[PDB]
Amino acid sequence: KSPIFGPEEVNSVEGNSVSITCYYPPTSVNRHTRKYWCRQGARGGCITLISSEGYVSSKYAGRANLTNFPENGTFVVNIAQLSQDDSGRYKCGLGINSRGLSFDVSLEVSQGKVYTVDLGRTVTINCPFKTENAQKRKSLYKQIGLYPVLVIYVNPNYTGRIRLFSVVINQLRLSDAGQYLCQASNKKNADLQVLKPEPELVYEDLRGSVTFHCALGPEVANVAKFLCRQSSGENCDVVVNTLGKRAPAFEGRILLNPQDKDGSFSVVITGLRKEDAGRYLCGAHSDGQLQEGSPIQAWQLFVNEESTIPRSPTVVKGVAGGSVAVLCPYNRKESKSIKYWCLWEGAQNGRCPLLVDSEGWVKAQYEGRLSLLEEPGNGTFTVILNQLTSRDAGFYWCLTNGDTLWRTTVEIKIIEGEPNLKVPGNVTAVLGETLKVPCHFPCKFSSYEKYWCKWNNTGCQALFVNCDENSRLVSLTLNLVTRADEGWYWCGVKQGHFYGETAAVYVAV
């Protein structure tokens, strides 16, 4: 697949302007290579109409420009003064016109009481009448194939939605896009045009995250909203719901955020795969499915396989009592942010509650056993969790505070086994007289650096510490035990910047 993405089908009337946005992977070649807008005509061969190297055609002279934003990673084509000669098949692309790297756009312009509404909203058709028609059957009519049929006594097709002068119709199905006549001996004509929603182009990466901002109106805020995905035909795969559903594929990586004062929620998906691309449809129907007459809203996702998001362990394993050290990557250029770490608790609830952050807040039940580090810098941070149980198995999200968020999910599994560092249970010192704590370690770690750290909220930092390398043993010896020397201490291994297995002991005085 070429990684270029833009509108599959642009529409306009004659005489107006068009802006076509095409997205490319912002590598250093794509930003400096040549962008074109060729017209794929017949007989073979694109004919370049405008380019980013200066060329504007003779048909397009004075009424187009191709401007290029390498920071966004995209380029846009403005075309003024259309006419029906501009209807055809086009391509937006990069480089040489015949080598691929293009998206095929299909621009189809058309000839210039017409009501134009959206799917599922309401129409008020205000039709005049005469003074000599104050008794007879006030009515609408529809023309289903040049046949005048009664509609409104209500039509069996329109049962429950229409009401009588003017008429008002609620929750418009797409198959009410005909033309109606208001008759009170006289007749008025009125054309309804129910619009499909134009899909907003979301161009995301592989192993990244998408936030669908699902802002319908406040008139529909007390209805059970949903997120479908249109398949190859017609049925939608309901991905999330506000009634408790969730797809089995989106387990641990979905999030349906709570609504607002005007019914504007958002749906967060992380860890994007090649098969997650397609058309997604927010909506608000009282069953949580997609039915005729539900105010939808569409996005078109493109999951770019040419991703620069670093590939990570998507599953970490750790034994009961052991430890887990997760590397969460973030965007390298925003190195000063506030880094978080999260959990996962369902979809309709959509809860990712915070465990630890980079400023020195650790949760209540995770004191003495969780820490967030800064090493190794420049696009990664380490999160060390020890004292594991079987109920620490779950999906954990690597949030940050910047604007380019890839909320990297990782699943911790709790397998059978015994930990590597063998610390005592919970040693009890006494006042003034010393304490000696050991930490034996296997032969795998005799290359690694060893430490003992005392745990605070701001990140634990190393200490005195002896390291007997012959009999493998890292001693901790506190000289004068005060009440301050309390809390949790950790022995653990470390290879320069990358941290390893830890184990914890608590020193009570």
């Binding site: 290579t33 040549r34 086994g417």
Partner: protein, 128 residues
């Protein structure tokens, strides 16, 4: 429907494959091996040195297109070990789009002869 085995960019070969598994008759299945060589036809022999003759012989061994010069991680019974999945790990027939090919030439500039550095493929060669 066709998975991609190789996408070599040094010789521009793109082996794909697809099992067309006949459920009708049991062991008459059709494995496919679409290969898509592109022959550059205008490039030199040492492609990073524009004094060489034109390349007129193009030899494509499938064992040398398909190779994986990238280490992997394997879970062996408790551990994650790193592995070297190659056995054979060169001349290049095409330039790469995402790669910067330069060539140093000796221009003069007055009383010196400075070894300036030209760019064979521009737009893949900008500094950031």
């Amino acid at each position: 429907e066709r998975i991609v085995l190789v996408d070599n960019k040094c010789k521009c070969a793109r082996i794909t494959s697809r099992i067309i598994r006949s459920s009708e008759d049991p062991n008459e299945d059709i494995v496919e091996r679409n290969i898509r060589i592109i022959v550059p036809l205008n490039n030199r022999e040492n492609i990073s040195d524009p004094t060489s003759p034109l390349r007129t012989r193009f030899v494509y061994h499938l064992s040398d297109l398909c190779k994986k010069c990238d280490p992997t991680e394997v879970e062996l019974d408790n551990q994650i070990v790193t592995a070297t999945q190659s056995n054979i790990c060169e001349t290049c027939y095409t330039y790469d789009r995402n790669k910067c090919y330069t060539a140093v030439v000796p221009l003069v500039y007055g009383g010196e002869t400075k070894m300036v550095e030209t760019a064979l493929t521009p737009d893949a060669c900008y500094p950031d």
